[PDB]
Design a binder for this molecule. Structure first.
Ligand SMILES: COC(=O)c1ccc(C[NH3+])cc1
Length: 279
């Protein structure tokens, strides 16, 4: 399938070159997979989700996304226009309040929730979790992400936006999950993207158009925006039968566009997420 005039990041993930605007992907489109978006919530009523999004858990007085961040990330995973995996099922877990903040104890509970809740969902092609959040190093946060991954969920986490080594941030620093840095439309490392040995992959993260609350759209930047590109890609590849939750990060790294990004510090992988779809 070909989506013309796609957001640059979608075009980038199906291209061997920057500077194109059509997204090419297998029509299976993540059908039969599920992606949990662990964030500020999801505005499931947005027409862009086509009834494929739902809130499954909140730790606050509402499950609604009063912020927008979670809706934007969910849109990059799976919205009809802005999403990588246009037929996946999206499950929202609201661990962050409407200001975008959340206690680590709530975030940990949300991860353990997903590890169990997937057994209440129909995801025959596999389960992914997208975590566009983080803070300072915490062994407990890292352990929760490791448990979620161990339980059979492909966990993708943001590297962070500190222009620093991700070793000092969690869950970015957990080795067993997929830690995602951000790039721009010119194949440069995003100016804010963390780096370091713990990164597994880069995805589009600067000026990413997606869904927003109030039935709207907007373009924002962050490793929060790169992470759902990788989560959606994992769901797409799992539906194709090319990889599994346990191996999807390594598969994405192995099949990535290699050596094409600029301003990647020595010791950080130079790997850009790529679907290898041959139309
Ligand atoms: C240190 O000057 C740079 O910004 C830089 C230029 C090219 C590369 C190789 N991709 C890495 C870094």
């Amino acid at each position: 399938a070909a989506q013309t005039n796609a957001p640059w990041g979608l075009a980038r993930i199906s291209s061997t070159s920057p500077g194109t605007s059509t997204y090419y992907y297998d029509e299976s489109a993540g059908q039969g997979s599920c992606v949990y978006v662990i964030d500020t919530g999801i505005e499931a009523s947005h027409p862009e989700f086509e009834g494929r999004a739902q809130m499954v858990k909140t730790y606050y007085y509402s499950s609604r996304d009063g912020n927008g961040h979670g809706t934007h990330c969910a849109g990059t995973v799976g919205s009809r226009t802005y999403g990588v995996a246009k037929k996946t099922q999206l499950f929202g877990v609201k661990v962050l309040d409407d200001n975008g903040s959340g206690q680590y104890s709530t975030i940990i509970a949300g991860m353990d929730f997903v590890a169990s809740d997937k057994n209440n969902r129909n995801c025959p092609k596999g389960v992914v979790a997208s975590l566009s959040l983080g803070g300072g190093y915490s062994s407990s946060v890292n352990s929760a992400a490791a448990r979620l991954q161990s339980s059979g969920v492909m966990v993708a986490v943001a590297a962070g936006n500190n222009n620093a080594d991700a070793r000092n941030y969690s869950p970015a620093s957990e080795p067993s999950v997929c830690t995602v840095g951000a790039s721009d439309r010119y194949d440069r490392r995003s100016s804010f993207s963390n780096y370091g040995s713990v990164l597994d992959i880069f995805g589009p993260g600067t000026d990413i158009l997606s869904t927003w609350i109030g039935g709207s759209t907007r373009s924002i930047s962050g490793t929060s925006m790169a992470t759902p590109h990788v989560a959606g890609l994992a769901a797409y590849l799992m539906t194709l039968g090319k990889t599994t939750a346990a191996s999807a990060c390594r598969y994405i790294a192995d099949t990535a566009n290699k050596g094409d990004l600029s301003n990647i510090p020595f010791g950080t992988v130079n790997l850009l997420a790529y679907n290898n779809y041959q139309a």
